[PDB]
Amino acid sequence: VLYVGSKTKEGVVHGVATVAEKTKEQVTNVGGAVVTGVTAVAQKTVEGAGSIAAATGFVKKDQ
Amino acid sequence: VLYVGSKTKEGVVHGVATVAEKTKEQVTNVGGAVVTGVTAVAQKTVEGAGSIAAATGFVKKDQ
Amino acid sequence: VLYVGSKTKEGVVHGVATVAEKTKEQVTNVGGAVVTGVTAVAQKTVEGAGSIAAATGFVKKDQ
Amino acid sequence: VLYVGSKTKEGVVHGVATVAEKTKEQVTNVGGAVVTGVTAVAQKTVEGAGSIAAATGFVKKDQ
Amino acid sequence: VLYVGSKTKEGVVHGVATVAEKTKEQVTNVGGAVVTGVTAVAQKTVEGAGSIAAATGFVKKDQ
Amino acid sequence: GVVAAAEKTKQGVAEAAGKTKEGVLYVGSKTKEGVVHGVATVAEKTKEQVTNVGGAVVTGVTAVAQKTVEGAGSIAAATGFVKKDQL
Amino acid sequence: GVVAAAEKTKQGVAEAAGKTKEGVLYVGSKTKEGVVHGVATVAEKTKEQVTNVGGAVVTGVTAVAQKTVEGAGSIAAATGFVKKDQL
Amino acid sequence: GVVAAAEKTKQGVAEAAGKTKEGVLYVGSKTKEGVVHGVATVAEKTKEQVTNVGGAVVTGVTAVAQKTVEGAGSIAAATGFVKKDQL
Amino acid sequence: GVVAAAEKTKQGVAEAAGKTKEGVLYVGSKTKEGVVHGVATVAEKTKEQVTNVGGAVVTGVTAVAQKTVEGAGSIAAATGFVKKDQL
Amino acid sequence: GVVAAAEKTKQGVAEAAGKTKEGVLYVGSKTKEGVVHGVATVAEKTKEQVTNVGGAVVTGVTAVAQKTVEGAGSIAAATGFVKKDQL
């Protein structure tokens, strides 16, 4: 009937950082999945069932 | 009837940081799933059943 | 009936940064999926079921 | 009936940065997928069921 | 009936940047995909089911 | 004088002088070298009498901003300076 | 004079002078070096009488901002300086 | 003078001079290097009489901000300095 | 003068001068080097008379801010200094 | 003068000058070296007046901030210093 929404956050990601210095890394992958970086996922769904927000670094071989 | 919502957050991720310095790393996987970068996921669903927010860094081989 | 929404955010990603200095990296993958960069995904759906927002770094060989 | 929406943001990404200095990198992949850059994806969907926002660093060989 | 929308954002990407200095890079790919650049995708769809916004950096060999 | 108003309507949105910095703003460097900034002086019931005989008299504020002053035996900034040197 | 108003409406929304810094704002360096900032002076019930005979008189404040001054035997900043040197 | 108002409304949202810093704000370095900041002086009931005979007089505040000064036998900052050296 | 108001409403949301920092704020370094900050002086009932005969007089505050001074036999900062060296 | 109010309301939310620091704030280093901060002086109904004969007089306070001073036989900071050395 009477709604006031001010500065409301729903499904929000903010303030994600990564700092590296003098860093060395080696990756040798064969048929797999390697994730080293940053993933920032924000999701807001209405009337949506079975919703996946993030799916990172999997190796799926279902039947 | 009479709702006021100010600065309300629902399903919010904030303030995620990683700091690395003089770090060496070596990854060698074969058919697997390696994750070294953390993920920030925020999810809000309305009338959504069976919702997954994060599915990071595994291996699924269901039959 | 009477709605005022001011500075409201739904499914928003903001403020994602990575800083690197004197960093070296080697990647050698064969048939795989290696992710090192930044992914920032924000999603809002209305009446959308089974919606994925991010699917980074996958290797999928389902049957 | 009476809606006022001021500076409301839905499915919005802003403020994504990457800073690198004195950084060397080597990638040698065959049949694979290597992602080292920045992907910033924002998606809003109305009455759309089963929508993917981002699919990065993928290797899919379904049958 | 009475809608006022002032400075509203839906499916908007802005403020994405990368800064590189004294950076050298080497890529040698055979039959694969390598992404090192910036992708900024903003999508807003109405009455569209099954919409993908970004499909960066993959290799798909479905049968 | 900035005024934004909305009276006697069913809906009103008023925005005064608002500033937004959305986007990418890049500055390589923003140095400032040898800068004098913001000098203010206030006096009340002002009355001045100056009598000078062979000298130098300056009334007011002094503000000197220099980046590089080269040379040996030089004077960069002087206020009320008397120099009587033999050689 | 910044004013934002919304009266006699069913729904009124008003923002005064508001600042947002959304996005990416990159600054490589923000150095300041040799800077004089914010010098204020207030004098109430003030009158001045100056009598000078062969000298130097300055009435007020002094602000000197330098970055680099090189050279042997050099004076960089001097207020009320008397120099009587043999050589 | 910053004002935001919403009167005689069913719903009113007033925002004054607000500041937001969402997003990425990167600064490589923010050095300060030889800086004089915020000097204030207030004087009430001040009458000035100056008599000078061959000297140097300065009446006020002194502020000197320098970064780099080289030189053998050099003076960087001097206030009320008298130099009488034989040679 | 910052005011945010909402009178005679059914729902009022007043927000005065508020600051938020909800992002990534990166600073590599924030050094300050040789800095004079915040000098204040208040004087009531001061009626100054100055008589100078061949000297140096300064009437006020002295603030010197330096980073680097090189040199053998050099003077970096001096207030009320008298130098009479034989050679 | 910061004011936020919501009166004659069935529902009121007033917010004064508030600060939020959510997110990631990163600082590599926050050094300060050779810094003078917060010097104050108040004088009420004091009694003084200056007469000088060939000397050096400074009236007030002194604040010197230096990071590094190098050199042999040098003087970094000197207040009321008298230097009469035969050579």
Side-chain angles (χ1 to χ4, degrees), chain F residues 4-5 8-9 12 17 21 25 27 32 37 40-41 46-47 59-60 65 69 75 77 79 84-86:
Chain F
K8 284 175 287 299
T9 43
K21 292 250 197 118
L25 302 85
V27 181
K32 60 182 61 176
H37 182 92
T41 309
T46 56
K47 244 173 229 171
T59 88
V69 177
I75 299 153
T79 319
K84 267 175 223 162
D85 304 327
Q86 331 303 352

Side-chain angles (χ1 to χ4, degrees), chain J residues 3-79:
Chain J
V3 172
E7 46 269 87
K8 216 88 75 213
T9 67
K10 281 214 244 143
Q11 297 181 330
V13 198
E15 187 69 18
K19 287 149 132 272
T20 80
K21 285 254 206 122
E22 46 215 71
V24 171
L25 297 75
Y26 176 104
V27 181
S29 178
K30 197 174 289 203
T31 89
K32 71 189 62 213
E33 61 212 296
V35 175
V36 174
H37 183 100
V39 187
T41 278
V42 185
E44 318 261 325
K45 308 225 202 126
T46 46
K47 307 252 181 301
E48 271 322 317
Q49 92 204 12
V50 177
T51 189
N52 190 63
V53 174
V57 176
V58 181
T59 279
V61 317
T62 313
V64 177
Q66 291 151 346
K67 182 236 156 70
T68 166
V69 164
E70 298 98 329
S74 74
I75 301 158
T79 325

Side-chain angles (χ1 to χ4, degrees), chain D, chain E:
Chain D
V1 172
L2 275 143
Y3 184 106
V4 171
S6 295
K7 342 203 160 180
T8 73
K9 53 181 67 176
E10 274 146 350
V12 170
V13 183
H14 60 95
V16 179
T18 278
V19 178
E21 197 230 29
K22 260 126 163 173
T23 283
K24 60 189 66 182
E25 202 253 23
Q26 189 170 1
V27 159
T28 306
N29 85 98
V30 308
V34 182
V35 183
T36 299
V38 189
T39 88
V41 187
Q43 201 189 46
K44 218 254 182 162
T45 303
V46 189
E47 264 158 35
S51 39
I52 306 144
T56 305
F58 229 83
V59 165
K60 163 197 227 170
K61 281 166 199 183
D62 285 358
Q63 227 72 14
Chain E
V1 186
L2 62 80
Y3 180 108
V4 169
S6 189
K7 321 172 165 223
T8 79
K9 296 175 177 170
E10 290 153 308
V12 173
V13 175
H14 58 98
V16 181
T18 73
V19 177
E21 199 218 65
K22 274 150 208 233
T23 282
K24 71 199 73 223
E25 175 271 26
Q26 211 277 340
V27 153
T28 301
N29 63 347
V30 176
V34 175
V35 180
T36 299
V38 192
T39 89
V41 190
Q43 205 188 50
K44 166 51 183 321
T45 88
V46 191
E47 310 233 302
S51 36
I52 303 142
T56 320
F58 296 97
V59 160
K60 161 196 228 173
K61 271 156 202 180
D62 281 357
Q63 228 66 27

Side-chain angles (χ1 to χ4, degrees), chain H residues 5-23:
Chain H
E7 298 94 352
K8 301 177 176 175
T9 53
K10 254 149 147 204
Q11 307 173 327
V13 186
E15 274 113 317
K19 288 147 149 278
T20 77
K21 289 247 206 119
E22 36 204 302

Side-chain angles (χ1 to χ4, degrees), chain G residues 7-87:
Chain G
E7 300 94 347
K8 307 202 80 70
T9 48
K10 253 150 154 213
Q11 299 170 319
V13 182
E15 304 80 34
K19 302 192 9 162
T20 74
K21 290 248 200 118
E22 323 176 4
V24 167
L25 312 95
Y26 179 105
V27 179
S29 271
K30 220 194 276 233
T31 88
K32 65 219 289 163
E33 31 182 23
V35 177
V36 165
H37 185 98
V39 187
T41 301
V42 166
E44 309 275 323
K45 305 288 193 195
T46 182
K47 64 190 35 166
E48 299 87 9
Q49 285 173 348
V50 181
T51 281
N52 193 59
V53 179
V57 174
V58 183
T59 88
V61 317
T62 319
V64 175
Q66 299 148 350
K67 178 257 169 56
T68 279
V69 174
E70 220 206 299
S74 69
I75 301 156
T79 88
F81 191 110
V82 177
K83 191 175 160 193
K84 276 166 181 41
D85 301 328
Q86 322 321 343
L87 257 176

